[PDB]
Amino acid sequence: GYDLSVSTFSPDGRLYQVEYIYKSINNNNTALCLECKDGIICCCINSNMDKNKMIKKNSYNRIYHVNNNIIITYSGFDGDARNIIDRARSEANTYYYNFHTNIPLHILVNRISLYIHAYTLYWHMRPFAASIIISSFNEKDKGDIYCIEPNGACYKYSGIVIGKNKEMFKTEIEKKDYKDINVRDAIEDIYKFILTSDDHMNKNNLQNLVNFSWICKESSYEFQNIHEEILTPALNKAVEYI
């Protein structure tokens, strides 16, 4: 009876609706961000759409950006995450209007965390069902990656995975330190981890179900999606390895 409203604590001091949101997110499509020596690399594996064959090639992209220098991705429902990303862009716009400089990453993360958290307080609002990764990289400060949970918790990482099969992806990513590995070498490792972890993914759908993006030295520390010419030899080498 206590699990029918986000605004009610259960006798053991838990909000069951947020836990059910966590269960919803853990079944959704995988997303990961990884700090590297020269950049951050973001990768979204949309394994759920392996059934739908008529979807346009690479149309579905869960990787978005703010200010052309902050990557923002998610695992969860598309509409809620679009709402959060619109809030992030609004916060960046308001900050630049007030102060004439771009929003710091930690301030944006805190504000979006509060925005997510506010919907877990009242009996009439649906809490957002999405975990949100927000990340950036700079020449001086290196990489900063944050993950905002559906409960409003925000935590900083060197690398993070959310969504389906995140345990296996985390286990494979943890095998080696990536802060002394470049992003171009890291793409092959990400493809190998996807082939070993997600059972729906295979050689014939890696090219059209996976979104890639990064912020590194080669992109002048600004947002970009990986071109096909860089992706194709990497996934070919991963398939040959596997």
Binding site: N98, F99, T101, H106, I107, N110, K156
Partner: protein
Amino acid sequence: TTIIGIIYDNGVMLACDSRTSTFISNKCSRKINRINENLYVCRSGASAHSQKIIEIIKHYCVSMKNENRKKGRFHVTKNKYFYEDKFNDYNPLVENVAHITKKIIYTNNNFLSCALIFGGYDKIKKQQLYAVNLNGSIIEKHDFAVSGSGSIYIQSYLQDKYKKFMTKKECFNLILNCVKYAMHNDNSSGGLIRIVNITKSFVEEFTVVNTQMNFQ
């Protein structure tokens, strides 16, 4: 009123008179206001308007400074203060405070008649002068800024004497002589001269008693 800012090699010096209002209502005033430990601003124009602008922008700067804090662990009478924020971790940028002040002035520029000179130091752009004009336009000055009634009388004089990389001593002498000449020529400016020198690691505020001597 005379308010002056000059960037020198290792800091920025602001200076002002003390006279307020044919009748002198006050002769010991504070036209230079401490917004933050690394950021001061000089006022000119209507007094109540500028003072409420100072209070609003102090509130904004305090909010910005509290929000700028990251989580975790990292790493002739003078009065001197060392910055608590040694590494400039969370002190707001001078550009940010000057630009929100410009926004507030421009939004209310129908009735607000205030010209401000922000001076300060941050780790990104080092020492900066910003001039916020009457209608709410902001211009960054890399050599000097001047405003108020008296400043006009010294314009060419400052333009004659400014050097690109002045030391502390000669910049102090220049700014003091500039305010002295402006007070000599302008009735609306007078009294003791307040100077604020802002540097990488400290701020020192000088008070000066003055007299103009000439046999021209």
